[PDB]
Design an enzyme around this catalytic site. Structure first.
Site, PDB file in Angstrom:
ATOM      1  N   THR A 182       0.821  -1.225   0.000  1.00 63.86           N
ATOM      2  CA  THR A 182       0.000   0.000   0.000  1.00 63.86           C
ATOM      3  C   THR A 182       0.850   1.268   0.000  1.00 63.86           C
ATOM      4  O   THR A 182       0.392   2.314  -0.449  1.00 63.86           O
ATOM      5  CB  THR A 182      -0.917   0.039   1.216  1.00 63.86           C
ATOM      6  OG1 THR A 182      -0.185  -0.442   2.357  1.00 63.86           O
ATOM      7  CG2 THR A 182      -2.159  -0.826   0.970  1.00 63.86           C
ATOM      8  N   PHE A 208      -6.015   4.755   7.149  1.00 59.42           N
ATOM      9  CA  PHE A 208      -5.352   3.756   7.973  1.00 59.42           C
ATOM     10  C   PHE A 208      -6.308   2.980   8.864  1.00 59.42           C
ATOM     11  O   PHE A 208      -5.892   2.405   9.853  1.00 59.42           O
ATOM     12  CB  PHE A 208      -4.234   4.405   8.798  1.00 59.42           C
ATOM     13  CG  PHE A 208      -3.153   5.024   7.955  1.00 59.42           C
ATOM     14  CD1 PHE A 208      -2.188   4.228   7.344  1.00 59.42           C
ATOM     15  CD2 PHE A 208      -3.122   6.399   7.740  1.00 59.42           C
ATOM     16  CE1 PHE A 208      -1.200   4.793   6.538  1.00 59.42           C
ATOM     17  CE2 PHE A 208      -2.129   6.978   6.941  1.00 59.42           C
ATOM     18  CZ  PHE A 208      -1.166   6.168   6.346  1.00 59.42           C
ATOM     19  N   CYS A 240      -4.102   0.675  11.317  1.00 58.96           N
ATOM     20  CA  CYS A 240      -2.755   0.351  10.839  1.00 58.96           C
ATOM     21  C   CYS A 240      -1.726   0.580  11.922  1.00 58.96           C
ATOM     22  O   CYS A 240      -1.637   1.675  12.480  1.00 58.96           O
ATOM     23  CB  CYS A 240      -2.391   1.209   9.620  1.00 58.96           C
ATOM     24  SG  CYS A 240      -0.879   0.672   8.709  1.00 58.96           S
TER      25      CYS A 240
HETATM   26  C1  HEM Z   1       0.273   4.132   3.251  1.00 56.84           C
HETATM   27  C2  HEM Z   1       0.387   2.805   3.398  1.00 56.84           C
HETATM   28  C3  HEM Z   1      -0.611   1.992   4.265  1.00 56.84           C
HETATM   29  C4  HEM Z   1      -1.958   2.016   4.219  1.00 56.84           C
HETATM   30  C5  HEM Z   1      -2.852   2.888   3.283  1.00 56.84           C
HETATM   31  C6  HEM Z   1      -2.446   1.057   5.188  1.00 56.84           C
HETATM   32  C7  HEM Z   1      -3.762   0.766   5.473  1.00 56.84           C
HETATM   33  C8  HEM Z   1      -4.229  -0.080   6.477  1.00 56.84           C
HETATM   34  C9  HEM Z   1      -5.615  -0.305   6.844  1.00 56.84           C
HETATM   35  C10 HEM Z   1      -6.841   0.334   6.158  1.00 56.84           C
HETATM   36  C11 HEM Z   1      -5.646  -1.180   7.858  1.00 56.84           C
HETATM   37  C12 HEM Z   1      -6.913  -1.725   8.565  1.00 56.84           C
HETATM   38  C13 HEM Z   1      -7.400  -2.987   7.870  1.00 56.84           C
HETATM   39  C14 HEM Z   1      -8.832  -3.329   8.237  1.00 56.84           C
HETATM   40  O1  HEM Z   1      -9.486  -2.649   9.072  1.00 56.84           O
HETATM   41  O2  HEM Z   1      -9.351  -4.330   7.695  1.00 56.84           O
HETATM   42  C15 HEM Z   1      -4.274  -1.537   8.172  1.00 56.84           C
HETATM   43  C16 HEM Z   1      -3.842  -2.405   9.167  1.00 56.84           C
HETATM   44  C17 HEM Z   1      -2.573  -2.943   9.313  1.00 56.84           C
HETATM   45  N1  HEM Z   1      -1.387  -2.461   8.731  1.00 56.84           N
HETATM   46 FE1  HEM Z   1      -1.353  -0.943   7.317  1.00 56.84          FE
HETATM   47  N2  HEM Z   1      -1.353   0.490   5.824  1.00 56.84           N
HETATM   48  C18 HEM Z   1      -0.205   1.020   5.265  1.00 56.84           C
HETATM   49  C19 HEM Z   1       1.093   0.707   5.636  1.00 56.84           C
HETATM   50  C20 HEM Z   1       1.519  -0.302   6.484  1.00 56.84           C
HETATM   51  C21 HEM Z   1       2.887  -0.648   6.802  1.00 56.84           C
HETATM   52  C22 HEM Z   1       4.140   0.088   6.237  1.00 56.84           C
HETATM   53  C23 HEM Z   1       2.845  -1.683   7.650  1.00 56.84           C
HETATM   54  C24 HEM Z   1       4.002  -2.453   8.312  1.00 56.84           C
HETATM   55  C25 HEM Z   1       5.222  -1.923   8.441  1.00 56.84           C
HETATM   56  C26 HEM Z   1       1.474  -2.018   7.892  1.00 56.84           C
HETATM   57  C27 HEM Z   1       1.014  -3.042   8.696  1.00 56.84           C
HETATM   58  C28 HEM Z   1      -0.291  -3.250   9.104  1.00 56.84           C
HETATM   59  C29 HEM Z   1      -0.746  -4.307   9.999  1.00 56.84           C
HETATM   60  C30 HEM Z   1       0.086  -5.417  10.678  1.00 56.84           C
HETATM   61  C31 HEM Z   1      -2.254  -4.097  10.139  1.00 56.84           C
HETATM   62  C32 HEM Z   1      -3.214  -4.907  11.015  1.00 56.84           C
HETATM   63  C33 HEM Z   1      -3.230  -4.122  12.343  1.00 56.84           C
HETATM   64  C34 HEM Z   1      -4.048  -4.831  13.410  1.00 56.84           C
HETATM   65  O3  HEM Z   1      -5.216  -5.184  13.141  1.00 56.84           O
HETATM   66  O4  HEM Z   1      -3.551  -5.050  14.546  1.00 56.84           O
HETATM   67  N3  HEM Z   1       0.694  -1.146   7.184  1.00 56.84           N
HETATM   68  N4  HEM Z   1      -3.440  -0.822   7.333  1.00 56.84           N
END
Ligand code: HEM
EC number: 1.14.14.1
Length: 456
Positions: free
Chosen positions: A264, A389, A396
């Site tokens: 992403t 996020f 996130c």
């Molecule tokens: C701009 C870039 C990014 C966007 C737009 C983004 C977006 C999101 C979104 C929307 C969710 C929630 C998912 C849901 O509710 O179903 C999420 C969760 C998550 N993201 Fe990101 N993300 C980004 C970058 C990253 C990066 C760089 C990492 C790791 C280094 C990461 C790791 C995670 C993890 C492990 C979750 C699950 C969190 C949890 O439920 O405990 N993301 N992200």
């Protein structure tokens, strides 16, 4: 409640029979408004598009994260990692507590040097292009972001810049994700025709797992100390249970962070650059800030924090094209939404993020215009108006990691090159659960500013 056209027993399902289902759903949201019912055989969802309704869906005491049908398919390879686990699964709370400190300011300062390693590689690739050549933007951003999470998080080098084609990990991930998006649309899932799809799916999971084996094996044999994301996976203990993560879950966390940790962010950088080349005053304004702030040969941590206008550009790109465009919720209890839409315990809601971000009642009638200035005063923006996020405790975990990486990289890019939209690129958004602008190409004419050596 509105509901789009239906086709007998298939109900709404054929509307997702398209390469771009998120964009199809945006057009539906535009026609029907803030909420619509979407039915497929054995499935019902309510798609939300207004800040007014999404603010209630954001209430964690009423709604929790749901694993939509697609995340369930992703779960076949991501298991109970942080992204694909239910909030109450033992390993969610356990891994979240264990790994949260890996994304603190103190931790971010520690990842900085390795983020610079990979960014230097990007800049060097582009400096080293001949006059006849051009840049494939998403392809190079994916090289950058995969490499950054691999190195910062796992002390592992994918060496994506030493490959003319995508890394085999990317090729299998994209096929795996594409297959997950395909299964949704199959009205007839277990038909012997799709056995080839299934065989290939396992093959793709094998490829991703074999790489995880190497990351674990290379750490085991290290000799040096890393003190990174993977250290904390291997050695960290849950305060509230006294336990560390077991081996099975560690493998799921690695797959999870490799995929969630790059894909992403690659999309975001690609969109940001797309918007920059299509809005010349914004570009010049961003370039002026990069030159003004980035005075040393490589960027320090503090300097990236100072790239305020770059941050605004990145936020305004997430506004128009949030690269994870959707997240799913379920009602914890019988409840009424907005005082008008009754939901039973377990009813599903989809937050349609690009539509949330185009709610004219929040942003103004000019929602379609690219305007970083909207983000000048971030606390001027209402709560839940802006959610690239996700939400609450299931938001996130990598948010500051992504933004720091994207700010650093875009800063360096703007410092070192002038960019040209030489094909007059026509925006074509490709969907693989996530979004990226397909076939986006530019030319980068070097400003010929010397680049410092990699720190550490
Ligand atoms: C701009 C870039 C990014 C966007 C737009 C983004 C977006 C999101 C979104 C929307 C969710 C929630 C998912 C849901 O509710 O179903 C999420 C969760 C998550 N993201 Fe990101 N993300 C980004 C970058 C990253 C990066 C760089 C990492 C790791 C280094 C990461 C790791 C995670 C993890 C492990 C979750 C699950 C969190 C949890 O439920 O405990 N993301 N992200």
């Amino acid at each position: 409640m509105p509901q789009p056209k239906t086709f007998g027993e298939l109900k709404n399902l054929p509307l997702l029979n398209t390469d771009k289902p998120v964009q199809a759903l945006m057009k539906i949201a535009d026609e029907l408004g803030e909420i619509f019912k979407f039915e497929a055989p054995g499935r019902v969802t309510r798609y939300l598009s207004s800040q007014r309704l999404i603010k209630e869906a954001a209430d964690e005491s009423r709604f929790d994260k749901n694993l939509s049908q697609a995340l369930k398919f992703v779960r076949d390879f991501a298991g109970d990692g942080l992204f694909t686990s239910w909030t109450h699964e033992k390993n969610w709370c356990k891994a979240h507590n264990i790994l949260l400190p890996s994304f603190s300011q103190q931790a971010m300062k520690g990842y900085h040097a390795m983020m610079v390693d990979i960014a230097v590689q990007l800049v060097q690739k582009w400096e080293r292009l001949n006059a006849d050549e051009h840049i494939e933007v998403p392809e190079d951003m994916t090289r950058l972001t995969l490499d950054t999470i691999g190195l910062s998080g796992f002390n592992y080098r994918f060496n994506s810049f030493y490959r003319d084609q995508p890394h085999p990990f990317i090729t299998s991930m994209v096929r795996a994700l594409d297959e997950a998006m395909n299964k949704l649309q199959r009205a007839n899932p277990d038909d012997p025709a799709y056995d080839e799809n299934k065989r290939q799916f396992q093959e793709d999971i094998k490829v991703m797992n074999d790489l995880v084996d190497k990351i674990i094996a290379d750490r085991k044999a290290s000799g040096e100390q890393s003190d990174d994301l993977l250290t904390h996976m291997l050695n960290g203990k849950d305060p509230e249970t006294g336990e560390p993560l077991d081996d099975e879950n560690i493998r799921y966390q690695i797959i999870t962070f490799l995929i969630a940790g790059h894909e992403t962010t690659s999309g975001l950088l690609s969109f940001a650059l797309y918007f920059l080349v299509k809005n010349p005053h914004v570009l010049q304004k961003a370039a002026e800030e990069a030159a003004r702030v980035l005075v040393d040969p490589v960027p320090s941590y503090k300097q990236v924090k100072q790239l305020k206008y770059v941050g605004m550009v990145l936020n305004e790109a997430l506004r128009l094209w949030p690269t994870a465009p959707a997240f799913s919720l379920y009602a914890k209890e019988d409840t009424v939404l907005g005082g008008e839409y009754p939901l039973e315990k377990g009813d599903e809601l989809m937050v349609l993020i690009p539509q949330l971000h185009r709610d004219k009642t929040i942003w103004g009638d000019d929602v379609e215009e690219f305007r970083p200035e909207r983000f000048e005063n971030p606390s001027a923006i209402p709560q839940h108006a802006f959610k690239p996020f996700g939400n609450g405790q299931r938001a996130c975990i990598g948010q500051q990691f992504a933004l720091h990486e994207a700010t650093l990289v875009l800063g360096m890019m703007l410092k070192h090159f002038d960019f040209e939209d030489h094909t007059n690129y026509e925006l074509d958004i490709k969907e693989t659960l996530t979004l990226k602008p397909e076939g986006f190409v530019v030319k980068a004419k070097s400003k010929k500013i010397p680049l410092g050596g990699i720190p550490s």
